[PDB]
A = this chain, B = another copy of it.
Amino acid sequence: WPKGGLPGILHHYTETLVTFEYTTTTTRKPHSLLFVGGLGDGLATTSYLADLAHALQPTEWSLFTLTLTSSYQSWGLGHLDRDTNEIAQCLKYIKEYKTEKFGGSASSGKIVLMGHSTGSQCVLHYLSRPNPHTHTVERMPLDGAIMQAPVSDREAIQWVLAEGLGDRTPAEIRPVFEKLTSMAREAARDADAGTDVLLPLAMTSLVYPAHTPLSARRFLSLTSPESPESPSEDDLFSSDLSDEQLGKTFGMIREQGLLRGKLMVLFSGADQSVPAWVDKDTLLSRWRNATDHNGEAAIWDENSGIIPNASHALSNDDQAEPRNFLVNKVLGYLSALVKA
């Protein structure tokens, strides 16, 4: 969005997939921040990314964004495993690239994975899931991990059905939601194996804040009842998940050994996607206690919190001050990482 575009380097970490490095200068950049946008974003995330790149100019960190297969196939369920593999491939590339370019020590360069919106799912999934060594793509450990506005899509839809979305009131959205579920359930039962029934964009965008296309199977994941015993792949950040369930995700960060550093969560204080019935402070403390195993570890970054007056994506002209604050928290996190 800055006039004249943003200068940088377009890399190929696979033959099909790319990562864009933001850079204007000769300066040394041994360290790397890989930013993972929302599902279906690719390199097209805006929000605070320009301000972050501008702020990282004087530093020893260069900002990366990337494309995944899920950037192009944003409508399918069961996507986080593939996302995670491609992030790992991108991290491997960045690590060799930064060694080759600036030399120094082989593993001097530090890597931080930042998730934005539903990109935060990829961050937690990267850290929490099994890391097998199967040969028929090992994930490297991160020096840091950030999740910006990790919000439940399930609970966001509940809030849309309660309050409305845009011009549309609850009474107008409801008939479409009920029709969409009925369509999605019918497709799950009746569609041929391997096919995906894409639901109408006209209908889904009335109920879905992300405004990305939806298959029947993917939509069902977002609306079917979360089981008190277990939720879906996407449903990592719902406020009514049990401590047992948080132990399977946040609690597995310590066990997998892929974060040799801190996890910082940055909630948005005026996040319009989060229901007013959700206590955000309780939610962060429960994630902290799950992550730290009730004081046994110190993985959770205490500097995690709720950005005052920030919206979900911090998009507005209103959001100049929260954006600047958010960017300053990222630079402070990154500064603490390089000070020993």
Contacts and interface: CB of A to CB of B under 8 A. Distances in A.
Contact of A5 (B11, B46, B186, B191): B11
Contact of A16 (B40, B186, B199, B216): B40
B1 A5 contact: no
Interface string A170-195: 00000000000001001100011111
A89 B220 CA distance: 35
A73 B12 CA distance: 21
Most buried by B among A21, A67, A193, A195: A195
Contact of A4 (B5, B42, B74, B101): B101
A183 B196 CA distance: 12
B8 A9 contact: yes
Contacts of A213: 73
Given A12-B5, A21-B5, A195 B197 contact: yes
A48 interface: no
Most buried by B among A7, A10, A16: A10
Copies in the complex: 2
A292 B7 CA distance: 42
A202 interface: yes
B46 A67 contact: no
B15 A6 contact: no
Nearest to A1: B12
Given A10-B43, A16-B40, A74-B72, A197 B199 contact: no
A202 B194 contact: yes
A218 to B, nearest CB: 12
B194 A199 contact: yes
A200 interface: yes
Given A4-B101, A16-B40, A195 B202 contact: no
A44 B16 contact: yes
A202 B213 CA distance: 21
Interface in A251-277: none
Contact of A186 (B17, B71, B192): B192
Contacts of A196: 197-198
Interface of A: 1, 3-12, 15-18, 20-21, 39-40, 42-44, 46, 67, 71-74, 97, 100-101, 183, 186-187, 191-200, 202-203, 213, 215-216
